[PDB]
Enzyme design. Structure first.
Site, short mmCIF file in Angstrom:
data_model
loop_
_atom_site.label_atom_id
_atom_site.label_comp_id
_atom_site.label_asym_id
_atom_site.label_seq_id
_atom_site.Cartn_x
_atom_site.Cartn_y
_atom_site.Cartn_z
N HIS A 46 49.74 41.31 37.51
CA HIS A 46 49.66 40.80 36.15
C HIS A 46 50.63 41.53 35.23
CE1 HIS A 46 45.27 39.74 37.26
NE2 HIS A 46 46.00 38.64 37.34
N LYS B 296 28.48 34.54 32.90
CA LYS B 296 28.10 35.92 33.23
C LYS B 296 28.09 36.23 34.73
CE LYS B 296 23.89 34.67 34.61
NZ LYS B 296 23.34 34.95 35.97
N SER C 229 42.85 40.05 41.45
CA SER C 229 41.69 40.76 40.92
C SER C 229 40.53 40.71 41.91
CB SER C 229 41.27 40.13 39.60
OG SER C 229 42.28 40.33 38.63
N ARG D 50 51.68 34.23 43.10
CA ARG D 50 51.63 35.25 44.13
C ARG D 50 51.08 34.63 45.41
NH1 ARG D 50 46.10 35.61 43.10
NH2 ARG D 50 45.52 34.97 45.22
#
Lengths: 157, 157, 157, 157, 157, 157
Positions: E17, E41, E127, E90
């Site tokens: 990033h 959440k 991530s 990516r």
């Protein structure tokens, strides 16, 4: 008991190819790099130059040997007493074509093809793009073995 | 001297997986099939059933063994004294994700991943689609080993 | 009321092509196989040979006919009183290019293109790879119709 | 004599889907739109709403009919007396999965799947993205039929 | 006069990033990193942690600012007085989905999306994979900024 | 302070290219369209014709200029005082090759390449397919600028 062939034109060999040679040599008892002849005449380096460049770039791989290939890759493979081909994947690989050939090679000779992703730092070099860039004056020396850079620079100077 | 790991959930093992086991066993001195645990609980067959199905479907492969995997695949691989993973490609494989994992696995543990195209006749079976079709009453018996069909039919009847 | 065109160079026709002919003939009232001329001269089989090979390989399809195509495929299609093209997908198909042409063909003539996956067993044959392998002495006879094998062997002997 | 099924959840139908319905109806004697049930409960529109939206959006297609699908698509297809499925391709289609299912559907029931590229102007709409954008206040009215926009706006207001 | 938005969940930000942030900041007068809220959440780091990690990892980029995004990305973009989004590619990127969203974003708000390939060395981190590997005890510290590693290790210890 | 180069052969320029020029001009202070020379001689329009067609098709873009490119694109880019290339994606783009070149261009000169999806209506035109269709008598006038159609028709008549 185990062996793999790494076929290609290697005109010239790149660090992408060497990465793949190293991984094959680490996983198989013997590796044979098969340098294909350029029948229709039009490469940059002649056969003897290509052999030398591969040999000089692989002295750290004692279980690897270099030979000229003639005819069907699967004929060469089986002539080596092997049934496996190891090929690299990189950015720009025509993987659909590689898959087609792999399935055809399996069909005609029972030879398996194992694909391995080349190291990211060497994933964008190819023989053809390396030559094209260098001919136009670009620096690709970090992506080719020193034995190749030596010869490339000579053709430049 | 040479070895490969074949990791997966194998819920259940298919003839596509067995095809890949056979090719690994032909090319490596030893093969270990690593059956991953289903931590979040929700598979069709429990761990013991999956082990049995793989064992029963691979009795023709004397140099292959079956073990439960825990944690990172590369940890399991290196615990086997190996540095290679062999994975199949078929229709519907998320190859970009497989490539991402392969590059990550190389980065963290130095483990190579070799990809091989599954036989065309077994290229469209997956564990998940096989289960979904069979649950809806479709015949997938030609795409699964008999030890799996036996168990699948029992769950049906 | 319904019809489809199956265009191609068919140099030579393969069982992959025949698979697609069979599926078009099963789904459309009439099918026309359009054999494109090789303008820049350089194929293996001349036009008459290609027509014969397709005809001989499709005698089991009474609602299929064979014709030479000239000019834009969509012109040929509309000349047949049809508005559909049926094309096969196999391993190595340049699908992005096929999609580009399909969208262009729709734009210029309103002709739809339907794509169908060829049978797995015939998914890795192409005219070009079949010829290349056979010329180098490989056996592709299971992937081509007998009328083609007959002619291929003659060129060999 | 000819027929095709167009299966989907159509939650809601988009102009991308309608484009595909129109092309199937132009090429086949009869078309059946099979609206699949949402078993695990969680769609936006209930079954009756989805049927109505498709019917209202296809009044210009006299040879097309709408029915609820249950079980394997190939079971529904064969129950319609047909052996063909017609599916659209658009930006974001999981084509590898569509191919896997097509090969599986052929294997289990002999049903062919024909793929057709949706019109460029409707190539980026999907039911899921259309709903997500509209729920966040974006205008997707040009990409959905008026019968759908009417209902979407009602849920908003 | 020129500006770009870099949207994402950044849970946590990676060097992949940051590579993209650096290239946007080099090519546009102003860059805004839009950190999307996690409505349903279930992330690893809460919003404040994600903001801090991005800020701390971008102190070398004076023309870059960090803000929380709410609602449609294109609404956030236009609220910044901009009409461009810059996104990284990516290994493992769902590019078809990214293309679909880009075309939709252009359609609804006239916002352009520019894609740029991340540096090879950071091309296999995401991530999600970074978190999964680290949770299982793998070292991904070379692929994340030090502000992220600091926080990741704390959650471990 | 910001600038981008849009390189290509533009033989001839299409509305797909112009779409990309417009988006670059909207996002960068200055845009330079670099028309590459055809060294091996074999294009349809000579260099002067290509320049004129691009100029005439871009009079609405005051911050855009047209220049002939020589040698490596990255050399031209850096000669313009810029470090960015903007390239379009459309149906049929060889994106793997574009990615390979982008990574190579970054490696040798530090130049970034930004990719943007062309508008759907212009996503299936390419210079090569436009010429091939028009030469065979097909109407592609909606996909090319009027300055190009004028010249194309002249070559026809």
């Amino acid at each position: 008991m185990t062996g793999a062939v790494c076929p290609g034109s290697f005109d010239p060999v790149t660090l992408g190819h060497v990465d793949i040679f190293e991984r094959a040599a680490a996983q198989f008892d013997e590796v044979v790099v098969a340098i294909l002849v350029n029948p229709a005449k039009t490469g940059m380096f002649d056969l003897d130059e290509r052999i030398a460049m591969v040999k000089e770039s692989t002295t750290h791989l004692p279980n690897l040997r270099v030979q000229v290939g003639h005819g069907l890759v699967v004929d060469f493979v089986r002539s080596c007493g092997m049934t496996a081909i190891v090929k690299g994947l990189r950015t720009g690989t025509d993987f659909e074509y590689e898959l087609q050939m792999a399935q055809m090679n399996k069909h005609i000779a029972g030879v398996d093809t194992f694909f391995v992703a080349t190291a990211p730092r060497y994933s964008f070099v190819s023989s053809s793009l390396a030559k094209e860039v260098a001919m136009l004056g670009g620096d690709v020396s970090e992506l080719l073995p020193e034995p190749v850079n030596r010869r490339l620079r000579d053709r430049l100077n």
